[PDB]
Design a protein around this nucleic acid. Sequence first.
DNA 1: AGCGCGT
DNA 2: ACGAGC
Lengths: 10, 8
Amino acid sequence: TXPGVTXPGV
Amino acid sequence: XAXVXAXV
DNA sequence: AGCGCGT
DNA sequence: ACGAGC
Ligand SMILES: *C(=O)c1cnc2ccccc2n1
Ligand SMILES: *C(=O)c1cnc2ccccc2n1
Ligand SMILES: [Cl-]
Ligand SMILES: [Mg+2]
């Protein structure tokens, strides 16, 4: 997640 | 990700 | 496949 | 002294 707790996703 | 001081 | 930090 | 999260 996040990148950040990427995205979800990417 | 660990939060030992930032917890990010 | 895809990445961030401060007490 | 530290790795979490669809
Ligand atoms: C969480 O596992 C984690 C790992 N490495 C990092 C590097 C830089 C900033 C934040 C980070 N968070
Ligand atoms: C929190 O601000 C912080 C800063 N530096 C660290 C280095 C190593 C482990 C934990 C840390 N936490
Ligand atoms: Cl990114
Ligand atoms: Mg990027």
